[PDB]
Design an enzyme around this catalytic site. Structure first.
Site, PDB file in Angstrom:
ATOM      1  N   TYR A  83       0.824  -1.208   0.000  1.00  0.00           N
ATOM      2  CA  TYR A  83       0.000   0.000   0.000  1.00  0.00           C
ATOM      3  C   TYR A  83       0.862   1.263   0.000  1.00  0.00           C
ATOM      4  CZ  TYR A  83      -3.838   3.151   1.351  1.00  0.00           C
ATOM      5  OH  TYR A  83      -4.751   4.179   1.409  1.00  0.00           O
ATOM      6  N   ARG A  88      -1.165   8.010  -3.955  1.00  0.00           N
ATOM      7  CA  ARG A  88      -2.053   7.059  -3.297  1.00  0.00           C
ATOM      8  C   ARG A  88      -3.390   7.703  -2.903  1.00  0.00           C
ATOM      9  NH1 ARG A  88       0.522   4.446   2.040  1.00  0.00           N
ATOM     10  NH2 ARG A  88      -0.369   6.384   2.893  1.00  0.00           N
ATOM     11  N   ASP A  89      -4.435   6.878  -2.777  1.00  0.00           N
ATOM     12  CA  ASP A  89      -5.710   7.313  -2.198  1.00  0.00           C
ATOM     13  C   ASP A  89      -6.235   8.559  -2.915  1.00  0.00           C
ATOM     14  OD1 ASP A  89      -7.783   6.880  -0.316  1.00  0.00           O
ATOM     15  OD2 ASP A  89      -6.848   8.302   1.099  1.00  0.00           O
ATOM     16  N   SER A  95      -5.490   9.369   3.509  1.00  0.00           N
ATOM     17  CA  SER A  95      -4.339   8.469   3.394  1.00  0.00           C
ATOM     18  C   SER A  95      -3.397   8.820   2.244  1.00  0.00           C
ATOM     19  CB  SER A  95      -4.813   7.021   3.243  1.00  0.00           C
ATOM     20  OG  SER A  95      -4.921   6.399   4.503  1.00  0.00           O
ATOM     21  N   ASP A 135      -7.955   0.142  -2.764  1.00  0.00           N
ATOM     22  CA  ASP A 135      -8.573   1.314  -3.411  1.00  0.00           C
ATOM     23  C   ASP A 135      -8.075   1.647  -4.805  1.00  0.00           C
ATOM     24  OD1 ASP A 135      -9.906   1.419  -1.002  1.00  0.00           O
ATOM     25  OD2 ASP A 135      -8.530   2.965  -0.182  1.00  0.00           O
ATOM     26  N   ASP A 313      -8.679   5.745  10.276  1.00  0.00           N
ATOM     27  CA  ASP A 313      -8.822   5.857   8.818  1.00  0.00           C
ATOM     28  C   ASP A 313      -8.431   7.244   8.314  1.00  0.00           C
ATOM     29  OD1 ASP A 313     -10.020   3.246   8.558  1.00  0.00           O
ATOM     30  OD2 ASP A 313     -11.932   4.123   9.228  1.00  0.00           O
TER      31      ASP A 313
HETATM   32  O1  LIG Z   1     -27.577   3.501  -9.322  1.00  0.00           O
HETATM   33  N1  LIG Z   1     -26.844   4.045 -10.134  1.00  0.00           N
HETATM   34  O2  LIG Z   1     -27.292   4.329 -11.238  1.00  0.00           O
HETATM   35  C1  LIG Z   1     -25.531   4.402  -9.777  1.00  0.00           C
HETATM   36  C2  LIG Z   1     -24.712   5.131 -10.648  1.00  0.00           C
HETATM   37  C3  LIG Z   1     -23.423   5.487 -10.249  1.00  0.00           C
HETATM   38  C4  LIG Z   1     -22.964   5.122  -8.981  1.00  0.00           C
HETATM   39  O3  LIG Z   1     -21.703   5.487  -8.595  1.00  0.00           O
HETATM   40  C5  LIG Z   1     -21.021   4.907  -7.487  1.00  0.00           C
HETATM   41  O4  LIG Z   1     -21.510   5.429  -6.250  1.00  0.00           O
HETATM   42  C6  LIG Z   1     -20.969   4.737  -5.120  1.00  0.00           C
HETATM   43  C7  LIG Z   1     -21.719   5.169  -3.858  1.00  0.00           C
HETATM   44  O5  LIG Z   1     -22.994   4.498  -3.844  1.00  0.00           O
HETATM   45  C8  LIG Z   1     -19.460   5.002  -5.068  1.00  0.00           C
HETATM   46  O6  LIG Z   1     -18.858   4.194  -4.053  1.00  0.00           O
HETATM   47  C9  LIG Z   1     -18.014   4.856  -3.110  1.00  0.00           C
HETATM   48  O7  LIG Z   1     -16.868   5.425  -3.755  1.00  0.00           O
HETATM   49  C10 LIG Z   1     -15.890   5.998  -2.880  1.00  0.00           C
HETATM   50  C11 LIG Z   1     -14.735   6.518  -3.728  1.00  0.00           C
HETATM   51  O8  LIG Z   1     -15.202   7.679  -4.414  1.00  0.00           O
HETATM   52  C12 LIG Z   1     -15.389   4.994  -1.847  1.00  0.00           C
HETATM   53  O9  LIG Z   1     -14.543   5.664  -0.910  1.00  0.00           O
HETATM   54  C13 LIG Z   1     -13.306   5.020  -0.630  1.00  0.00           C
HETATM   55  O10 LIG Z   1     -13.534   4.079   0.432  1.00  0.00           O
HETATM   56  C14 LIG Z   1     -12.372   3.348   0.847  1.00  0.00           C
HETATM   57  C15 LIG Z   1     -12.760   2.281   1.888  1.00  0.00           C
HETATM   58  O11 LIG Z   1     -13.716   1.371   1.317  1.00  0.00           O
HETATM   59  C16 LIG Z   1     -11.374   4.363   1.412  1.00  0.00           C
HETATM   60  O12 LIG Z   1     -10.230   3.683   1.935  1.00  0.00           O
HETATM   61  C17 LIG Z   1     -11.007   5.410   0.339  1.00  0.00           C
HETATM   62  O13 LIG Z   1     -10.176   6.445   0.874  1.00  0.00           O
HETATM   63  C18 LIG Z   1     -12.271   6.073  -0.202  1.00  0.00           C
HETATM   64  O14 LIG Z   1     -11.916   6.962  -1.275  1.00  0.00           O
HETATM   65  C19 LIG Z   1     -16.586   4.383  -1.110  1.00  0.00           C
HETATM   66  O15 LIG Z   1     -16.128   3.367  -0.215  1.00  0.00           O
HETATM   67  C20 LIG Z   1     -17.571   3.792  -2.106  1.00  0.00           C
HETATM   68  O16 LIG Z   1     -18.717   3.288  -1.409  1.00  0.00           O
HETATM   69  C21 LIG Z   1     -18.800   4.640  -6.408  1.00  0.00           C
HETATM   70  O17 LIG Z   1     -17.448   5.108  -6.382  1.00  0.00           O
HETATM   71  C22 LIG Z   1     -19.542   5.238  -7.605  1.00  0.00           C
HETATM   72  O18 LIG Z   1     -19.067   4.693  -8.836  1.00  0.00           O
HETATM   73  C23 LIG Z   1     -23.782   4.397  -8.120  1.00  0.00           C
HETATM   74  C24 LIG Z   1     -25.060   4.043  -8.516  1.00  0.00           C
HETATM   75 MG   LIG Z   2      -7.495   3.590   4.932  1.00  0.00          MG
END
Ligand SMILES: O=[N+]([O-])c1ccc(O[C@@H]2O[C@H](CO)[C@@H](O[C@@H]3O[C@H](CO)[C@@H](O[C@@H]4O[C@H](CO)[C@@H](O)[C@H](O)[C@H]4O)[C@H](O)[C@H]3O)[C@H](O)[C@H]2O)cc1
Ligand SMILES: [Mg+2]
Ligand SMILES: [Mg+2]
Length: 360
Positions: A83, A88-89, A95, A135, A313
């Site tokens: 990682y 990153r991130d 992070s 990620d 986190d």
């Molecule tokens: O119904 N529809 O039509 C439709 C259309 C489009 C849709 O789009 C989706 O929407 C989702 C939300 O529902 C998004 O999910 C979230 O994205 C974030 C990144 O941007 C994540 O964050 C990361 O989390 C990590 C730990 O897990 C961290 O370590 C890290 O730092 C952190 O950055 C969230 O978990 C994750 O739940 C999807 O990207 C997105 O593509 C969805 C539905």
């Molecule tokens: Mg983390």
């Protein structure tokens, strides 16, 4: 090998995490919670190499695991996380990380991997399971609208392929990070994810050591939800099992029969998020399902604890350089320290809220 890489191995217990738990237990006044806290150091977790200054420590863990193996005659397996990609991130502040593509980040990342490899070379008698770059690839599918992610795209792929080629040549079993049900489980993201994972597998040479994917890293999803979490509405794949069962066939057709490991380290308490995309020190989490090879599906090699519960986190301090607004949400535990550092209040809740409960 063809079968479950975890089978027949004792899982090396992180001394880093044991020491954190030991000190954490010492600070807990409730003798019942104290005793439960101490049980946690006997639960296998993954060891994160989030900074290149930690690479020499891998040598120390592998030496230690080798000595235990030689003393007891019982084969040891060491669990690690790669990682440290440049930039990153990329969708978050929490992070950030030490390498920048603006400052020779790509070469410095190869060197980081090379240092990891130089330690593994000195201790070839111990099995290693690595999770590759949480990620990273999930951001590549979903967040190309984010400037840092868009700029990082070539480097992420290059970096992950390098790591995989270097670890596979050393007989290390890799599981590439694959987001979670609420990230890549959405129909918007499934097919594109399957395509990307297949491409990485291909470009990494299709080594049998590239065993498959890791899900739910540092997240809180249920493996198999007894009751549906309201926050998952609209997504048919509302737990990790459903996500994996939707992904596995797709990926197969795309040319990779992949196996899976699932983080359940902070999954003991469901229904704790206002939005599914809230990930930072989510309040009232509990230690979840224990690491085990008795999984609900043949696609799943193991349930594991990848993110070590108790390490933060991200900082909730709005003044700090790494402050991310997800860490300031109403359903985040605050005040929270820097990502990767000990978060006592949070750990105390994980123990108290553990499901299944921890015994004395
Ligand atoms: O119904 N529809 O039509 C439709 C259309 C489009 C849709 O789009 C989706 O929407 C989702 C939300 O529902 C998004 O999910 C979230 O994205 C974030 C990144 O941007 C994540 O964050 C990361 O989390 C990590 C730990 O897990 C961290 O370590 C890290 O730092 C952190 O950055 C969230 O978990 C994750 O739940 C999807 O990207 C997105 O593509 C969805 C539905
Ligand atoms: Mg983390
Ligand atoms: Mg839907």
């Amino acid at each position: 090998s063809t079968g479950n890489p975890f089978e027949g191995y004792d899982i090396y217990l992180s001394p880093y995490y044991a020491e954190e738990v030991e000190a954490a237990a010492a600070m807990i006044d409730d003798p019942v919670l104290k005793a439960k806290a101490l049980k946690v150091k006997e639960i296998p977790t993954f060891i994160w190499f989030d900074v290149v200054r930690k690479t020499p420590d891998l040598g120390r863990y592998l030496a230690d695991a080798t000595a235990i193996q030689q003393r007891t005659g019982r084969k040891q397996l060491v669990q690690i996380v790669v990682y440290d990609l440049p930039d990153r991130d990329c969708a978050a502040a929490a992070s950030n990380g030490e390498f920048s593509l603006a400052d020779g980040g790509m070469e410095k990342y190869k060197d980081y991997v090379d240092r990891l490899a130089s330690e593994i070379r000195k201790y070839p008698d111990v099995r290693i399971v690595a999770v590759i770059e949480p990620d990273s690839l999930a951001n590549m599918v979903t967040n190309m609208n984010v400037a840092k992610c868009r700029g990082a795209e070539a480097a992420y792929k290059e970096g992950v392929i390098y790591a995989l080629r270097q670890l596979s040549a050393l007989g290390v079993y890799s599981y590439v990070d694959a987001g979670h049900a609420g990230w890549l489980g959405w129909n918007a993201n499934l097919a594109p994810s399957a395509r990307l994972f297949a491409q990485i597998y291909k470009d990494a040479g299709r080594s049998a050591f590239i065993r498959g994917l890791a899900t739910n890293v540092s997240n809180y999803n249920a493996l198999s939800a007894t009751t549906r979490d309201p926050v998952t509405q609209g997504n048919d794949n509302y737990d990790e099992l459903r996500f994996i069962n939707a992904l596995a066939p797709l990926l197969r057709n795309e040319g990779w029969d992949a196996k899976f490991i699932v983080d359940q380290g902070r999954s003991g308490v469901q229904n704790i998020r206002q939005e599914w995309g809230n990930w930072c020190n989510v309040y009232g989490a509990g230690f979840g399902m224990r690491p085990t090879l008795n999984t609900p599906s043949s696609a799943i090699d193991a349930i594991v604890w990848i993110k070590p519960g108790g390490e933060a986190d991200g900082t909730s301090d709005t003044s700090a350089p790494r402050y991310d607004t997800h860490c300031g949400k109403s359903d985040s535990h605050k005040p929270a320290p820097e990502a990767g550092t000990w978060f006592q209040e949070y750990f105390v809740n994980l123990v108290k809220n553990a499901n299944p409960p921890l015994a004395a």
